[PDB]
Design an enzyme around this catalytic site. Structure first.
Site, mmCIF file in Angstrom:
data_model
loop_
_atom_site.group_PDB
_atom_site.id
_atom_site.type_symbol
_atom_site.label_atom_id
_atom_site.label_comp_id
_atom_site.label_asym_id
_atom_site.label_seq_id
_atom_site.Cartn_x
_atom_site.Cartn_y
_atom_site.Cartn_z
ATOM 1 N N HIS A 1 153.834 24.759 118.206
ATOM 2 C CA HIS A 1 153.604 23.343 118.552
ATOM 3 C C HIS A 1 154.845 22.797 119.256
ATOM 4 O O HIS A 1 155.915 22.681 118.685
ATOM 5 C CB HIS A 1 153.258 22.559 117.292
ATOM 6 C CG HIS A 1 152.964 21.109 117.564
ATOM 7 N ND1 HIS A 1 151.835 20.687 118.233
ATOM 8 C CD2 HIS A 1 153.689 20.012 117.306
ATOM 9 C CE1 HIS A 1 151.909 19.359 118.382
ATOM 10 N NE2 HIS A 1 153.023 18.921 117.850
ATOM 11 N N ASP B 1 156.411 19.706 121.389
ATOM 12 C CA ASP B 1 156.286 18.289 121.783
ATOM 13 C C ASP B 1 157.009 17.990 123.061
ATOM 14 O O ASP B 1 158.202 18.266 123.163
ATOM 15 C CB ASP B 1 156.974 17.445 120.714
ATOM 16 C CG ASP B 1 156.218 17.437 119.494
ATOM 17 O OD1 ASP B 1 155.055 17.150 119.585
ATOM 18 O OD2 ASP B 1 156.761 17.752 118.408
ATOM 19 N N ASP C 1 148.079 17.823 116.015
ATOM 20 C CA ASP C 1 149.040 16.824 115.584
ATOM 21 C C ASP C 1 148.779 15.337 115.831
ATOM 22 O O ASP C 1 149.515 14.550 115.214
ATOM 23 C CB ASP C 1 150.437 17.170 116.101
ATOM 24 C CG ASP C 1 151.571 16.810 115.118
ATOM 25 O OD1 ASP C 1 152.774 16.590 115.540
ATOM 26 O OD2 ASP C 1 151.404 16.801 113.888
ATOM 27 N N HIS D 1 151.434 12.356 121.933
ATOM 28 C CA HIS D 1 151.369 11.761 120.592
ATOM 29 C C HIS D 1 152.725 11.369 119.949
ATOM 30 O O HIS D 1 152.730 10.876 118.836
ATOM 31 C CB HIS D 1 150.528 12.630 119.633
ATOM 32 C CG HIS D 1 151.082 14.015 119.453
ATOM 33 N ND1 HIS D 1 150.738 15.112 120.247
ATOM 34 C CD2 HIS D 1 152.045 14.477 118.606
ATOM 35 C CE1 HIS D 1 151.439 16.178 119.864
ATOM 36 N NE2 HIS D 1 152.243 15.824 118.870
HETATM 37 ZN ZN LIG Z 1 153.746 16.987 118.023
#
Ligand SMILES: [Zn+2]
Ligand SMILES: *[C@H]1O[C@H](CO)[C@@H](O)[C@H](O)[C@H]1NC(C)=O
Length: 1014
Positions: free
Chosen positions: A60, A62, A174, A441
């Site tokens: 994951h 970001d 997420d 997000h």
């Molecule tokens: Zn994230």
């Protein structure tokens, strides 16, 4: 067309109905803390019915959170992708899934050709698979559907061009709660499956008990089911390895082989992983297969998904080896031991879904149908994630401004083909990518570190400048005689004038039109209307004299109003908040009338005295202890008075009454009708002194809000023929009610200052008998019915208000439309409330590591529509949706897609024309051209233009509303050779259209069309 109002869909799970029946008890379920001790029959699987397990490695990543996009790219993501390329190339059976195309495109363009080829091979052969394929994994609460589609298209267009693949499975592990807008867009973009994770722990328990974690998710109004998309909800508290192998994290953590010491990670349950060997593989396999078979009990097929990953995983080569080799030893043992009756392997997401549907087709499972959303999320106890519906509101508002500027820049420049030297494609790609990145997000959600928020803001500012450049070059080309047009592609022919961003009191950014007998007698201005219908709207400009009149280009006078320029000051000497007027800048206001997707030119001319067609507003300052307020040449002197109630009416519109504190108290719709109580009030929520603290994610109030103590605020009343207003300087908010003849516009200049641990809310109090029902929108696309539940805490009753909310009874409705996403609710019958800003000193233990103490002044905008609805055809009491009226929808469009205003920069515009688009069809009011984008560069023999058409659904309330023209987007540009219906990303042709005609779409539907021109 399906009827979206009168037929209540029959679904197995309807989330509002489920919420009404669930108890939401938070009991200790054992090792699965929010579930129960799962039991399974060992005889369920046997030689003729094995459990097929797909272990899906993932990481994951970001695109900004604790570090900026570029910092994470350099420190983490480029290493993860470089090592994934090496390890997958060298280990043919290893697999990996990737979601964020913003990072993948950054990496791929920096690779040498040899490595680009190796990467294309591992994608083409199925080892590396893209999931979703958007620029980011977007927030689903605050994002507008137009921007969710923009970012999806940006990532998938890059994947089709460079990787030759278009994902049909989505992965969203997420975002903090989930919206049905995602399956809506995805199903119209070629998808077949999707996966979600963050849903309320009580919902996971309830659906797990009924094996309803896999479902066909359809829209709340869809009776037939054509919008349905197969969805897999993960069952546990996190997507990390301890919460993905089965119900017991103390066991699953032992199968995260990066937690043995040398990587600086450990298991909080105190049992560490151990390297798999021939002496322990049977005991380790026995423990792992038991967890898998327990997880499998929660689903209907014999195909099991086991994600294997966490945040920024698969970075080090040694990590790839430790996870791969240990899992390979477990698979070799498990798969060779018949008593387990399991076949386990690394797989991708699409492999999982293909096997599930093969099982479905073999008749081994049937799946339930579901409609509704998954807000408001709580991951444990009473920790509801409703704070991020408001966090960093300045940037939430900037999102909506940039959304509109991207649409307007793409539409204005689409009319022509441009030479590469004009850099139009370059600037539009930069603008689309920065707005797309902010959909992340941790972007629009307001959950990133302060310096990361600054990075997003700087990127969006550059994007706004790019849009302005493209827009002003396009207006100059569209409105100049062709044989005179002589562009310098770096020159500013027009400057944009935006009255509401950053806004009065936020930044002095607007230019004053400087006129004078000894310098310049007149100035051309141009308005653009991105909507596909004729539109009138008042527009205002700052001018250096009050003696200005307006004409259209045929020299026909246009009625105008001049008002002063008022700025509010927090006077640190007198300790009062009061307005100051300019003695050399004035506002001129007039009604512009602009063609559908068109332009209209006006001229502002100075005179030595009051012009015949310009009027001047009166101004009244209500306060005790007033001092003079000179206004230069302005012709009407300011009046003063002690605070008192006042009433105003503009045109034939409503009559509004205000309290002596400058706050609305009633609305009277017509001369004859009653003064309906509608009261604005500002209140504050605080933070708990013991227990859990509110932070960027969580809203944990210390009880109901307390009224802001107002003192005796200064109130300014401006009364004009075209526009009137009441403004009041309250603590932390300059609150303004503006009247132009229809529903009022509300503007709040919010500066929470140094008020720590405070959330400021704006509440409306009415006597409408709404009970426990209210309606909020999802992503600007649909309105969903909410029911306030007193069995849940206050913060659970807060929902995202991305564009509007309303309450109603049998006779009356009050709708509040917003120009920015904020959190809100209806905590008692007759009320609406929406949070303005929040300043929190504490971190809320979700990983951010700071509070929210970087607040800055923001100008929030709204429209307030009170209407009689007793004659409207509304859905039945059991329908989960609600719909706006025509006036509320137009009021929302006035906030999100206002007219654009351009001021000609030079002294004289040679070859100027008065209008563009007068022959464009004026489409029915419920239809919008959400996107108009030229898809080809100038070197393409066959030009292609893409359009996204959206039709909303408005209530029928008895207004004959008639005559409009059919809009065929395929004939907006000449020389059409072909018209095709495509997926919403424009990447796949779905239908070749007869007669080259693009049909209009049905209510609540969205379609895309591409016209080709010879
Ligand atoms: Zn994230
Ligand atoms: C990949 O695209 C199609 C299948 O989607 C395939 O036939 C084609 O040959 C591949 N690449 C090219 C040359 O577009």
């Amino acid at each position: 067309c399906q009827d979206v109002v009168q037929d209540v869909p029959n679904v197995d799970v309807q989330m509002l109905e489920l919420y009404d029946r669930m108890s939401f008890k938070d009991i200790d379920g054992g090792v699965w803390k929010q579930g129960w001790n799962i039991k399974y029959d060992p005889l369920k699987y046997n030689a003729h019915h094995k459990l097929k397990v797909f272990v899906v490695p993932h990481s994951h990543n970001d695109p900004g959170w604790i570090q900026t996009f570029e910092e994470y790219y350099q420190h983490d993501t480029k290493h993860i992708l470089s090592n994934a390329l090496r390890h997958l190339h060298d280990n043919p059976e290893m697999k990996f899934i990737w979601a964020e195309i913003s990072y993948f495109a950054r990496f791929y363009h920096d690779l040498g050709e040899n490595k680009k080829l190796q990467m294309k091979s591992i994608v083409k052969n199925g080892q590396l698979e893209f999931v979703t394929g958007g620029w980011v994994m977007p927030d689903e609460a605050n994002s507008h559907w137009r921007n969710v589609l923009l970012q999806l298209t940006e990532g998938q267009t890059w994947l089709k061009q460079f990787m030759n693949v278009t994902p049909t499975a989505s992965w969203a592990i997420d975002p903090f709660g989930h919206s049905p807008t995602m399956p809506y867009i995805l199903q119209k973009s070629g998808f077949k499956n999707m996966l979600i994770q963050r849903t309320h722990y009580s919902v996971k328990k309830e659906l797990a008990q009924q094996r309803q974690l896999e479902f066909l998710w359809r829209q709340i109004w869809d009776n037939k089911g054509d919008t349905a998309l197969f969805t897999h909800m993960m069952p546990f508290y996190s997507y990390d390895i301890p919460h993905t192998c089965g119900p017991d994290p103390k066991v699953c953590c032992q199968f995260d082989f990066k937690r043995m010491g040398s990587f600086g990670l450990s298991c909080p349950w105190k049992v560490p992983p151990r390297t798999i060997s021939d002496q322990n593989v049977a005991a380790r396999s026995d423990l792992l297969v038991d967890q898998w078979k327990k997880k499998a009990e929660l689903y209907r097929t014999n195909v099991l998904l086991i994600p294997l990953g966490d945040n920024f995983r698969f970075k080090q080569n040694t990590e790839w080896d430790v996870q791969r080799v240990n899992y390979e030893r477990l698979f070799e043992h498990i798969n060779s031991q018949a008593h387990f009756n399991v076949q386990a392997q690394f797989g991708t997401l699409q492999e999982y879904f293909d096997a599930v549907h093969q099982a479905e087709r073999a008749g081994q499972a049937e799946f339930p149908t579901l409609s509704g959303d998954f807000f408001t999320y709580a991951d444990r106890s009473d920790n509801y994630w409703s704070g991020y519906y408001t966090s960093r509101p300045y940037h939430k508002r900037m999102d909506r401004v940039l959304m509109h500027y991207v649409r307007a820049a793409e539409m204005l420049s689409a009319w022509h083909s441009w030479d590469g030297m004009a850099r139009i494609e370059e600037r539009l790609e930069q603008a689309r990518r920065e707005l797309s990145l902010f959909q992340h997000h941790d972007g629009i959600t307001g959950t990133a570190k302060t310096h990361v928020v600054v990075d997003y803001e700087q990127r969006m500012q550059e994007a706004l400048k790019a849009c302005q450049m493209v827009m002003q070059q396009s207006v100059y080309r569209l409105l100049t005689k062709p044989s005179i047009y002589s562009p310098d592609f770096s020159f500013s022919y027009f400057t944009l004038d935006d009255s509401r961003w950053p806004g009065s009191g936020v930044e002095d950014s607007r230019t004053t039109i400087i006129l004078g007998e000894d310098i310049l007698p007149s100035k051309h201005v141009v308005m653009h209307n991105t909507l596909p219908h004729w539109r009138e709207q008042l527009v205002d400009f700052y001018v250096s004299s009050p003696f200005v009149s307006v004409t259209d280009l045929a020299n026909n006078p246009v009625e105008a109003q001049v008002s002063p320029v008022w700025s509010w000051h927090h006077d640190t000497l007198t300790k009062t908040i009061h307005p100051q007027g300019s003695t050399t800048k004035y506002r001129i206001i007039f009604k512009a009338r602009v063609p559908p997707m068109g332009l209209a030119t006006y001229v502002l001319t100075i005179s030595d005295s009051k012009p015949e067609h310009t009027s001047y507003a009166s101004n009244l300052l209500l306060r005790k202890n007033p001092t003079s307020l000179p206004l230069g040449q302005y012709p009407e002197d300011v009046k003063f008075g002690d605070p008192r109630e006042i009433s105003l009416r503009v045109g034939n519109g409503p009559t509004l009454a205000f309290s002596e504190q400058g706050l609305l108290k009633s609305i009277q719709l017509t001369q004859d009708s009653p003064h309906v109580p509608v009261h604005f009030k500002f209140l504050k929520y605080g933070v708990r002194s013991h227990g859990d603290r509110s932070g960027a994610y969580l809203f944990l109030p210390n009880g109901p809000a307390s009224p802001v103590e107002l003192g005796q605020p200064v109130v300014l009343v401006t009364k004009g023929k075209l526009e009137s207003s009441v403004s009041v300087g309250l603590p932390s908010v300059v609150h303004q009610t503006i009247m132009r003849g229809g529903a009022p516009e509300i503007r709040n200049l919010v500066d929470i200052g140094s008020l720590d641990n405070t959330e400021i809310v704006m509440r409306l109090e009415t006597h409408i008998d709404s009970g426990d029902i209210f309606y909020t929108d999802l992503n600007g696309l649909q309105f969903i019915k909410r029911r306030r539940l007193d069995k849940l805490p206050l913060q659970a009753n807060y929902y995202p208000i991305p564009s509007g909310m309303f309450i109603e009874d049998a006779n009356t409705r009050l709708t509040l439309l917003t120009g920015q996403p904020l959190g809100g609710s209806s905590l008692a019958s007759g009320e609406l409330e929406i949070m303005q800003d929040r300043r929190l000193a504490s971190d809320d233990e979700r990983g951010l590591g700071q509070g929210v103490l970087d607040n800055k002044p923001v100008l929030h905008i709204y429209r307030l529509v009170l209407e009689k609805v007793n004659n409207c055809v509304r859905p039945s009491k059991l329908h989960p949706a609600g719909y706006l009226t025509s006036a509320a929808h137009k009021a929302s469009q006035s906030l999100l897609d206002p007219l654009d205003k351009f001021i000609f920069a030079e002294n004289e515009w040679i070859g100027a024309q008065g209008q563009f688009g007068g022959d464009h069809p004026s489409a029915r009011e419920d239809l919008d051209v959400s996107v108009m984008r030229r898809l080809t560069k100038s070197s393409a023999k066959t030009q292609r233009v893409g359009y996204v058409l959206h039709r909303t659904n408005l209530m029928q309330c008895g207004t004959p509303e008639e005559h409009t023209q059919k809009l065929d987007v395929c004939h907006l540009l000449p020389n059409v050779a072909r018209c095709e219906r495509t997926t919403l990303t424009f990447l796949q042709n779905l239908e070749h259209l007869d007669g080259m005609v693009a049909p209009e779409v049905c209510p609540m539907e969205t379609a895309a069309y591409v016209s080709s021109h010879s």
